[PDB]
């Protein structure tokens, strides 16, 4: 079990892809990257 190791590690890269998906107007704390 070594991949185990590196879903710990996805967890904090895909956090990041989420913001993403947290784009809509119902969300609060998100602003347009301009």
Same mark, same amino acid.
Request: charged share 45%; hydrophobic share 40%; net charge positive.
């Given at each position: /079990?070594?991949? =185990? =190791?590196?879903? /710990? =590690? *996805? =967890?904090?890269? *895909?956090?990041k892809?989420?913001k993403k998906?947290? /784009? /809509?107007?119902? *969300?609060?704390? *998100?602003?347009?990257?301009?």
């Amino acid at each position: /079990k070594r991949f =185990k =190791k590196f879903f /710990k =590690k *996805v =967890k904090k890269s *895909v956090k990041k892809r989420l913001k993403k998906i947290f /784009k /809509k107007p119902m *969300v609060i704390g *998100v602003t347009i990257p301009f």
